[PDB]
């Protein structure tokens, strides 16, 4: 698959716990990042997936909302966040008719975009949903200079009797990484099952991301490291 | 899945089991010490279902003469490679006939489990008795007893050596008198990408008294020794 669904979706949360991903820390850092620019009322997490960031962010802002494309990923988010408004929708083409102090897009979700025209589009959509003293925060994929082809990642986690193993292989394919992922899933009653997904995650350059912020009328800054080592862009309207 | 220890499962077996922390060197050292406590002048050994032949390599350095038996070609093939100066045979613990007799006959790592019932169990213990010296000793590592089997057991292990990464997950259930053990592998590498393999076996859950009967039926006075190389204890037989 390539669509974050079924057992992949149900697995995602556990998988990334196993990986040490710390949405509390990330949410806290992000909340702080936003208050630096909008000293605040409201946040929209776009491609909020399973709603992990949202869960921690809800204590930090008057209002938090989500936008997700996958229906199965979104169900999980709604169960984790029953009191929050979560939208089915496409970061490239969406209107909600309100603005927010922060509009965030985390964990390289932007790389699911296919080229400059799709990137520009979502940035125009983000700029449109951000209050003018507000901020747009996007964590990119890796740039091409930093892509390491042939990369193999192997990790195992157990929880609730249930063990999940995930192996990823990354190779080059045009201006994209083709990351191929297999899972083995095992539990005392359910047995073992095999899974696999393959994704194309576009390898936009620093300067293409920045293009898109500028065309959306946002000023743009890159800050290295970030939650994933890929860094973190911000954009402030009125440029 | 395959139940035959062939192709890919064979190539991996050795890496996988180093990965598991299996110390064939200490296992041999404990063997040789056991064999000799019983048979102080032993000097010869047959390892039945010797597999990739890991025990045998270390057993060379304790006994002047070692040989092996193994049903799987692809496993046998790797054992011969590891043991150039040894005579290793192709065939079946149930029905086999070399020309000779050895101070010790061994069958390790629950290979014995791979027999389907008492008939076969007794068949194999008869053959072992046929190939041991009077002053010698037969040693079989059993599979788990029924009193100790754990339906629903999961084992997951990953290991990396020289750019090959291998992950193994197993699940086990009860299936009649047997363990049903279903095992999956993901193998991966920078150029090779990821491939997926699997196997399923039936491993017979023999009761202690069934092992004992088989030894006894074959003229061997039996004793069970707790613990052993894998938790499963160790059965020793001496002619008389
Ligand atoms: C929603 N985003 C996820 C999702 O799309 C998933 C399918 O792939 C990636 O997940 P991981 O971040 O878990 O990746 P994993 O840990 O399995 O592999 C790390 C990836 O990062 C690359 N990488 C990693 C490092 C450390 C580097 O310096 N350069 C670099 O290009 C190699 C591999 O594609 C995305 O981030
Ligand atoms: C040549 N023998 C091998 C081979 O036939 C293979 C297919 O399965 C077993 O491999 P492992 O022993 O590595 O097994 P693993 O780590 O996958 O799991 C341990 C097995 O032992 C059972 N078990 C394990 C424990 C610890 C116990 O207390 N009781 C019990 O029944 C559950 C599982 O089938 C055989 O030993
Ligand atoms: N065009 C698009 N619009 C909105 N969401 C998208 C999208 N393309 C992919 N996605 C979503 O991006 C997500 C990648 S997983 C990222 C999850 C979440 N942001 C976290 O940090 O844990 C998936 O939910 C996928 O369905
Ligand atoms: N009927 C039989 N006769 C001889 N070998 C057998 C057999 N049935 C299974 N085997 C072998 O039993 C082995 C169990 S795997 C264990 C290998 C080796 N003894 C070790 O200690 O690591 C496999 O090589 C399999 O081919």
Curated annotation (Swiss-Prot), chain A:
> Outcome of altering residue 112 to A/N?
Strongly reduced activity
Q: What is the reaction catalyzed?
A: dTDP-3-amino-3,6-dideoxy-alpha-D-glucose + 2 S-adenosyl-L-methionine = dTDP-alpha-D-mycaminose + 2 S-adenosyl-L-homocysteine + 2 H(+)
Keywords in UniProt for this one? Antibiotic biosynthesis, Methyltransferase, S-adenosyl-L-methionine, Transferase
Q: Which residues bind S-adenosyl-L-methionine?
A: 4, 12, 23, 47-48, 68, 90-91, 106
- An example of a Gene Ontology BP annotation on this entry? antibiotic biosynthetic process
Q: In which pathway does it act?
A: Antibiotic biosynthesis; tylosin biosynthesis
Any idea of its EC number?
Answer: 2.1.1.235
Q: Which GO terms describe its molecular function?
A: protein homodimerization activity; S-adenosylmethionine-dependent methyltransferase activity
Query: Which superkingdom, per the lineage?
Result: Bacteria
Domain remarks: His-112 is a strong candicate for an active site that hydrogen bonds to a water molecule which in turn hydrogen bonds to the C-3' amino group. However, it is not conserved in related S.venezuelae DesVI methyltransferase and its mutagenesis does not completely abolish catalytic activity.
What PANTHER family is this protein classified in? METHYLTRANSFERASE, UBIQUINONE BIOSYNTHESIS O-METHYLTRANSFERASE, MITOCHONDRIAL
What do we know about how this protein assembles, alone or with others? Homodimer.
Q: Which family does it belong to?
A: Belongs to the methyltransferase TylM1/DesVI family.
**Function, in words:** S-adenosyl-L-methionine-dependent methyltransferase involved in the biosynthesis of mycaminose, an essential structural component of the macrolide antibiotic tylosin. Involved in the last step in mycaminose biosynthesis by mediating dimethylation of the hexose C-3' amino group.
Q: What is this protein called?
A: dTDP-3-amino-3,6-dideoxy-alpha-D-glucopyranose N,N-dimethyltransferase
Name the source organism: Streptomyces fradiae
């Amino acid at each position: 698959q390539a669509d974050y669904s079924g057992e992949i979706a149900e697995l995602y949360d556990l998988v990334h716990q196993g990986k040490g991903k710390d949405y509390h820390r990330e949410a806290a850092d992000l909340a702080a990042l936003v208050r630096r620019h909008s000293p605040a009322a409201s946040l929209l997490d776009v491609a909020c997936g399973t709603g992990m960031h949202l869960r921690h962010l809800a204590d930090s802002f008057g209002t938090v909302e989500g936008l997700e494309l996958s229906a199965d990923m979104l169900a999980i988010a709604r169960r984790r966040n029953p009191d929050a408004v979560l939208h089915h929708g496409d970061m490239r083409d969406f209107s909600l008719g309100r603005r927010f102090s922060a509009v965030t897009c985390m964990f390289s979700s932007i790389g699911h975009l296919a080229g400059q025209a799709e990137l520009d589009a979502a940035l125009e959509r983000f700029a449109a949903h951000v209050l003018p003293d507000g901020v747009v925060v996007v964590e990119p994929w890796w740039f091409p200079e930093n892509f390491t082809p042939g990369y193999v990642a192997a990790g195992t986690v157990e929880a609730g009797g249930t063990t999940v193993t995930r192996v990823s292989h990354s190779s080059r394919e045009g201006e994209a990484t083709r990351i191929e992922v297999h899972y083995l899933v095992a539990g005392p009653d359910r047995g073992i099952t095999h899974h696999e997904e393959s994704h194309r995650i576009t390898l936009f350059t620093r300067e293409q991301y920045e293009r898109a912020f500028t065309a959306a009328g946002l000023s743009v800054e890159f800050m290295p490291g970030g939650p994933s080592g890929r860094g973190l862009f911000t954009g402030l309207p009125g440029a």
